[PDB]
């Protein structure tokens, strides 16, 4: 686990260094603001129906009663430009505030503690995460537990020994073709079937697919010794 | 130069700071403008040289005050204004 983890962190440095587009999510916020600011400014050069876009010009062109007619067109149009800008900023602000609440939620479940949610901290079973500062944002490196290799085994829902169905207390029953072993779902660790690893409920005539085997009782050799 | 003034060059009117510029213009080149289509530089008609145009400093004024039940002492904050530009007030 020391090599897998350290080797994983190395790939993060190579990916972020080689691939500059992984941060495009943040670059969009910069581009959207640049277009809004650039556009908002360029609207000053527009006539908006007026003879010219320069205020001192119209005041230095039309007479006082005639100028006000044209000046109103610039004020009217330029006014709508601000409304369009403010309207978009309020809407875009909702998308950022929604992301901020999401980032604050992840740090609580992912970073601070351990999250049991499915794929909330990223694919696989979440362990812990590393918060990292990013411009106008934040980066989360999530360490997860991903199973790799598996092997097909024979299983049975229950074991029958003395006539009472035996069920696993934890894990599942597996067999290599000879003896039935107890093992966890996430890894293969053969364990002998014992009364401590199984529970007694019902009989053998109910469970469907129950099989017969020898349940080892650790108390037998103790009583004989 | 180096001051806020109202400049009129061959009919080009505007208010801003005028300074010497290392920016080069072509012989036919006189009135330039920025991405905003606002003139950022001009050539003096009589004596030929390039002048950099910057808008005179501006910004908001924020008042830092405690509660009225506390005291009337207030502190003024000048947004984006250098200390040397305050006396203009």
């Amino acid at each position: 686990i020391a090599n897998q983890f350290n080797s994983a962190i190395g790939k993060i440095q190579d990916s972020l260094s080689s691939t500059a587009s992984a941060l495009g999510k943040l670059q969009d916020v910069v581009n959207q603001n640049a277009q809004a600011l650039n556009t908002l400014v360029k609207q000053l050069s527009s006539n908006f129906g007026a003879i010219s876009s320069v205020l001192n010009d119209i005041l230095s062109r039309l007479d006082p009663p005639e100028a006000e007619v044209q000046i109103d067109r610039l004020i009217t149009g330029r006014l709508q430009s601000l409304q369009t800008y403010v309207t978009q900023q309020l809407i875009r602000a909702a998308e950022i505030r929604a992301s901020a609440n999401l980032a604050a939620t992840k740090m609580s479940e992912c970073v601070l503690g351990q999250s049991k949610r499915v794929d909330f901290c990223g694919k696989g079973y979440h362990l812990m995460s590393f918060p990292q500062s990013a411009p106008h944002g934040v980066v989360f490196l999530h360490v997860t537990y991903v199973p790799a290799q598996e092997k097909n085994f024979t299983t049975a829902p229950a074991i029958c020994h003395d006539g009472k169905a035996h069920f696993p207390r934890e894990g599942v029953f597996v067999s290599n073709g000879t003896h039935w072993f107890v093992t966890q779902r996430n890894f293969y660790e053969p364990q002998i079937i014992t009364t401590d690893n199984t529970f007694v409920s019902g009989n053998c005539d109910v469970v469907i697919g129950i099989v017969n085997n020898t349940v080892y009782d650790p108390l037998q050799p103790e009583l004989d010794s | 130069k180096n001051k806020c003034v109202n400049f009129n060059f061959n009919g080009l009117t505007g208010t801003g700071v005028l300074t010497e510029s290392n920016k080069k213009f072509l012989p036919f080149q006189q009135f330039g403008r920025d991405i905003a289509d606002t003139t950022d530089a001009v050539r003096d008609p009589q004596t030929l040289e390039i002048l950099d145009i910057t808008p005179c400093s501006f910004g908001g004024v924020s008042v830092i005050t405690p509660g009225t039940n506390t005291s009337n002492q207030v502190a003024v904050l000048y947004q984006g204004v250098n200390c040397t530009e305050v006396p203009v007030a």
């Binding site: 941060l23 943040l26 670059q27 910069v30 600011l37 908002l40 400014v41 000053l44 500062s133 990013a134 411009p135 106008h136 | 920025d34 905003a36 606002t38 950022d40 910057t54 808008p55 501006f58 910004g59 908001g60 947004q79 984006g80």
Partner: peptide, 22 residues
């Protein structure tokens, strides 16, 4: 990852250093 018409840019309440110290 990386005007003259009266558009002002407010500085952030917290510097890039403070967010790094969190």
């Amino acid at each position: 990852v990386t005007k003259f018409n009266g558009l002002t840019v407010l500085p952030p309440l917290l510097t890039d250093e403070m967010i790094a110290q969190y």
